[PDB]
């Protein structure tokens, strides 16, 4: 199995049903046709206060294939549409088809800049077991960020320090504690295609 309580076995598409009941899902997802991730929809952060967390099943890196009626083929959906399916408030329960890759399927790149003193990166971060997921960003701060980073990316390391499983106070102090050379290590989901187009 019943979707309401089905466990998530690795490497098997599982159809699940999640209690939402008008409360936010609270996930950060990536994927879209104009997106840096063009191969699927992937959870890069779970808010502890939201309904995904209250369900206890989904993890970071889970690949979302279908939401309700809609199969989530990001090749033919906007980044907006993708994100907005997860931020809608739904009245009852939501069905999802999920795939947990083991091992996980990721891209790993680097982003380097020379930050100017008192000119923010324009990033708002959410800390987790992988690193600091980017929750939102103001474009136009640093050319490097626009072309190489988007909402949903996970910053794994900042100027040498591993960001994995660190308190927000700690993360925020590290980022605000730099004015000069910036060396960011980044993990981004790259699922293999499990979706066909309409």
């Amino acid at each position: 199995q019943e979707p309401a309580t089905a466990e998530i076995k690795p490497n098997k598409k599982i159809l699940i049903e999640l209690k939402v009941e008008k409360k936010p899902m609270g996930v950060i997802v990536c994927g879209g046709k104009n997106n840096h991730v063009t191969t699927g929809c992937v959870i890069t952060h779970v808010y502890p206060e939201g309904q995904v967390a209250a369900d206890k099943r989904l993890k970071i890196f889970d690949h979302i294939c279908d939401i309700n009626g809609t199969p989530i083929h990001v090749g033919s959906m906007t980044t907006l549409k993708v994100h907005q399916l997860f931020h809608t408030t739904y009245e009852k329960a939501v069905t999802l088809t999920v795939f947990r890759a083991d091992p996980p399927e990721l891209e790993k790149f680097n982003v380097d800049l020379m930050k100017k003193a008192g000119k923010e990166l324009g990033l708002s971060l959410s800390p987790n077991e992988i690193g600091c997921t980017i929750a939102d960003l103001i474009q136009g701060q640093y050319p490097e960020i626009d072309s190489k980073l988007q909402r949903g990316d996970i910053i794994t390391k900042f100027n040498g320090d591993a960001l994995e499983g660190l308190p927000f106070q700690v993360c925020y102090a590290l980022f605000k504690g730099a004015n000069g050379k910036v060396s960011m290590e980044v993990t981004r989901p790259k699922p293999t295609l499990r979706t066909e187009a309409p």
């Binding site: 324009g122 708002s124 929750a135 103001i138 927000f168």
Partner: peptide
Amino acid sequence: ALRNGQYWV
């Protein structure tokens, strides 16, 4: 900073 309810770096 804190601006419109969020923390920015």
